Design a binder for these strands. Sequence first.
DNA 1: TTTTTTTGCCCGGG
DNA 2: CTGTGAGCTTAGCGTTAGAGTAGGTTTTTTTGCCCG
Lengths: 787, 787
Amino acid sequence: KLLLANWGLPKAVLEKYHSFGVKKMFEWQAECLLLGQVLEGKNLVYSAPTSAGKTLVAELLILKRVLEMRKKALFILPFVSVAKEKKYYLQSLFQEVGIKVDGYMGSTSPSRHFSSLDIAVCTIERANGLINRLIEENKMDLLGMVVVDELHMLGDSHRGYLLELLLTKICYITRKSASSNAVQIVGMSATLPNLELVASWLNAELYHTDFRPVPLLESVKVGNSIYDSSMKLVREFEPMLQVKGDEDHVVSLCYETICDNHSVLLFCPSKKWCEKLADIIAREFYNLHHQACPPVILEQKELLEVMDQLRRLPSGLDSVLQKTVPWGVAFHHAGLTFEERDIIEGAFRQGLIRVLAATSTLSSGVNLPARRVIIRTPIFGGRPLDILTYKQMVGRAGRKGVDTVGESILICKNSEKSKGIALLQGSLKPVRSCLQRREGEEVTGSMIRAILEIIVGGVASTSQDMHTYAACTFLAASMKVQLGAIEACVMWLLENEFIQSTEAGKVYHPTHLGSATLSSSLSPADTLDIFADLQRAMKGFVLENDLHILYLVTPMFEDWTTIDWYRFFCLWEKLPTSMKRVAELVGVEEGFLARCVKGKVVARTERQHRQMAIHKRFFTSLVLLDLISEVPLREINQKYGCNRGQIQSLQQSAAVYAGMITVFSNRLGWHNMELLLSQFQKRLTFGIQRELCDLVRVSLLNAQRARVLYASGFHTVADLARANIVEVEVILKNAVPFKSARKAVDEEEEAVEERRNMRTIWKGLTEREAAALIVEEARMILQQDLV
Amino acid sequence: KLLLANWGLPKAVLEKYHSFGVKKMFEWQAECLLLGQVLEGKNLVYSAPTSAGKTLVAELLILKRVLEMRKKALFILPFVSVAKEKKYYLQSLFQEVGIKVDGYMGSTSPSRHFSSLDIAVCTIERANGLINRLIEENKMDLLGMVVVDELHMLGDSHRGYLLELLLTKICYITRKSASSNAVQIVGMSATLPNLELVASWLNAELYHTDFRPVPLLESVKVGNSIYDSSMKLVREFEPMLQVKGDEDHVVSLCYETICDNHSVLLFCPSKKWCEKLADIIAREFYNLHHQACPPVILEQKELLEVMDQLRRLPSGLDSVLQKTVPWGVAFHHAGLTFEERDIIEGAFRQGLIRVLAATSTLSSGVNLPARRVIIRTPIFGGRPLDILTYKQMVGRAGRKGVDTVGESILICKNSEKSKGIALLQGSLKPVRSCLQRREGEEVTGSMIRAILEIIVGGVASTSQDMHTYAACTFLAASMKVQLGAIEACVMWLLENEFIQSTEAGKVYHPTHLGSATLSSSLSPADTLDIFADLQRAMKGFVLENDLHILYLVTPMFEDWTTIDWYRFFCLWEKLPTSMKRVAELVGVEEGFLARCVKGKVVARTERQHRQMAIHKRFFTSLVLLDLISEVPLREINQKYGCNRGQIQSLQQSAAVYAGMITVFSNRLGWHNMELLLSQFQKRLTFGIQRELCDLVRVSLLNAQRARVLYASGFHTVADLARANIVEVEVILKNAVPFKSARKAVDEEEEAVEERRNMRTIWKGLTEREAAALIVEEARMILQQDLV
DNA sequence: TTTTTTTGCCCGGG
DNA sequence: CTGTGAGCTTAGCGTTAGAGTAGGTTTTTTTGCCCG
């Protein structure tokens, strides 16, 4: 029977599914669950269209196996948003059963240690981290099920190949003893050409379907000609709205369906192009009630509440959104602050917004269905669009039940027509393993990390064991020089001190730099950079300011932003000698800054790669310093060029890097440097104690200045209006870390002015004056708060 | 009544007195207790000769006050040795009544906060510290008494002026409390002139006596004749055993009384001459028996134990004590290690040694009575002997029940004879406070400190309060320049940031540098060096090795040794680059050391008052680095020119500086420096753990290189003989902090070469060899253990 | 011409 | 590498910036102390 009640679920879960509004399974879900050995614990891989109840199968398999066996089930997800979504959803299903559901994702982590959980939801990197901890604890016996979503990610060399490493380690360490299935794996994937090879690699039952609740019409617009997937001409397009300077009539493609109250989604090659088209479409829709075609109903009093909520936010209401949002038009790209993204997505999900320009950010990691998807070009970023990304984009078409059909138009030039058709009539590439070397190529970083994670984990200490591991990879399954690739990795790992060549055959063991890389879950290519910095700090370290810790803690990135090397070069030359000293030690150099402004950005070498890495890391330190130096965000945007979305990506990554490089120092045994880093980690907590934000009402208090007046005397502004101006001066003067206003002998006055300046306040005032002004400000606040 | 039982003592203490001493008070003690107001709680000064029953009156006054008034006393003593002796004495005397006697002295401190104690036996430097902490905590009401010994010290510029400050602060705060006593001061002093002035300052009763249980027959020897103190000729000398070996015939003056079974104590100017002269005297007892008045009774049944009790010491039986001690002849000076002195204290107190040459270490701080004192010259060092020393050296002449009269003989040439007569017929100079400026002299550092302590404790806030305080000093009594001294100090503090100026006249407050100077109880004149070294080391701190953090905790002294600049230069040229960097980053300079080789003495200025005082502190850090490197002391003493008695005082002193400067860096707010110092503090500890001490001897293992074995679990030589060489190799390779062998880019070859040296044991071994030898040496020692 | 002795601070395990 | 729109704000016109995404340990509220 398709009715889910007939499957004998525990009634709490059945009632929750009924409350979630799903009561019957789809036929493909019954056929998948009835595969004979799957319910017996055989591994499974199934590919079905996204949304469409795809996860319902994996949820029922988890539910049974965690009830049939007390072992823990691990749910691995590609992104923190979908991880958090699935965590709270699974909690609402299972918590009434008494199942403990928590997860590892972002800076979120379980309230109590992994022993307490029954189901863990986590990101790929949190999953591969947890497995290394279960191996080191030798508590791998705890792991009873491992559910992998988006199993096609194995080919993504940047991240996602860790999904191959993770499953290879689970298979190897189990089959090392198993030679009734101990760790049932479930994969969820795409309609890959070689999906059955992945199923054979996992020794899994294979199921695949094409069923989707709302059928999807692919199409191309070529001039005015609209072609279906079979290239039958469905229409010659007529623009209902004539637009200045528009050759593609995207505004007519929007308006044609808006006439029936159906929302539109418009994928654009870039942030700028999203804002341009959200502006244009808003300016055309603004004309309608002046010039008028059927009427458009906007429920503008709801958009007033939406747009007010953007005004409430400390970001403020964006100057483009002022123009577009009143008319139900928005744009949505990663340069927005995360609360702005949630407001815009929420207003779309309620149907208040009706047209939404977006970059790829609504293709991956956000689920928002719309009746009509529009893709602005077949070329993205000066390259042809990836077929995987295209097929994710179009899958946004159609709300379940609300739409009878989902529509997608690829917009294309007649000059592009072949490149257009190639996306519809092409198909996904075969999945392949990033462990595979090209014949002429160095052994890949994915293999090097793969070998490191066993040796340093206390597993497979000999090359006989490593080959017995290596033959378990999907590289091996794909193949049925590779026999030499393991011995090339250990040659590389030895030459970079990650492992010890214990002898008398040979046996390999972790160095500290091994256990550090593993315990921090850094890439071996990152710890070559982080270590060569951290070792250079040990030679000579600046304690007097924060910059020389931020340089060690600041996240590694490649092109976190475009860097204007001239505004960096000038901003370096402006640095105080207090902090210009840090630049001297860190290795920022006039010769490289001058070449970065004057030349083309210089090519890499063994030396010049780290030289570049220092500068790119140092520039990111200044931005992170300005964030802790309490520069208002609106200034930093001008000062460096990084938008307010990138700044949150840096605030998130920097805090985590403090924890990682504390632990990296512990495993190295550098317990002095580790204690500096562990105490600095207390200061990268950017979260405002909003209880202090009362004192923040007076302009003269930074968060520390408020907290020290919150600490000393528990000043409310109502009490700061009552304070003795000299007592405020005393409480300020004795809150700061002491810096001598005297020159010391054999200093230079540059340094002495900076110690004085570091105690002046706004550089322009001294406490003997400012302590009066702040009491005057407090009574000027109080007399207004009373009215 | 002289019978102690009539005074109403608690019987436990009375019977303890019967056990320890005698049932009757001396005739003078019943006078001093019956100065009519003393028993009512009036302050008291008294003087009695050379500890002949001196302290019994003070101890009885403590017992009365602490039992009946029930407030907490503070007993202030000039040395830790005297303080240690008195602590056990006052414990064993009072503890049966439950008086919670403990004390603050050296590294020793009570197991609980002050509020638990009833008597705090205390050194001077730690009594001032404790008074400050009472003032800062506003606990000064807890103090019920202070009792003071050697109150004639107030005139010393180097120490003991603290005893003026301490009593001034007690008087000042008492008067501010009063403006039957809140505190009773009992002061014990030499028979000074102007002692009535000291008594008048404290508003105290006065007692003086010349009473002795054993009279002193002072004399001087000149030209083979003896003269009385009254310059009566006693006799022409009767030289026996007369020999050319030393024409002053010291050997005759010693042996002449040895015939009576009574001991000789022979003070000499210097260790080199003292130790030499005990060897000469031992050769004469050799010359007697090897040619045998009677030959000296050697009692070798005990000397052959005591002399082997020295062989058991980590430095063996001293290479000169080997020659002299078989005869009952010894020497005792502060160039011997502390245990050698404590043993020789026993061997003289039991009378097994009969001739003991000494420096002034037996003059003050330890009480070894002997029948005849001999003083080899009126000159000591480059100057005439201080009469306060002479009248203490000759004070050693009598032991209450063992002999009937004490003797002393100063030895003089026929020339310069009057230099001795001025010692015989002289008397002590009147004591004058070191606060006293000369009219043309820049105000003295002991005044500057006195002004600081009252500001930072906050009991004197204004210029009026500091003129009111100054009227409580002993300077004020001595002057009946004071008007210009107080303001000139408040200027000098301001111009060095110890204090701050505010309005509502001017009112003064401590900086953090004030509270750091006071809480470390450093001298203000020292804090200007210590802070300058910290400030220059918040820059450019070398975390790679301890030498920099040693330099910040190295004790600073005036000529802690004479420094051989050529040997220091030969060390500085030869340090590892990782340490030669630390030399540069504290200002050690090749051209300066070249100058100090070219000439030791120069005109100076505050730049040169740093330069010649940076290097002297760094040379002392080199010695501390060798101690914590576990270098053999036989090498150290050869390497630097230090000697083994100093080294043990440096070990104790450096363990103090690391704990003061942690409080210094705490109260400056330099918390990122505090948590480095507070971590290195734990490693300045040269003892051995409860269970390691037997293991660390064997297989040539350094303390932690042994401890890392025991850190795996309890292990013994029998276990180290069983362990697999490869298991120990991994255990050793897991012990060290990581130090990469790779050369970094932008690094010198010499800078990595040290990291590949720092890994080696010592003949330099890697663990592949040493982890075998450690087991082979263990099993071969086990083959000597089992037999 | 080389050359005497002395002293400071904090808190642990439970 | 390959590619294009709208790019700057000069004045009406030329030619350039450009997607989104992830890691770590430790893990809650309060005065006073006593013993090796």
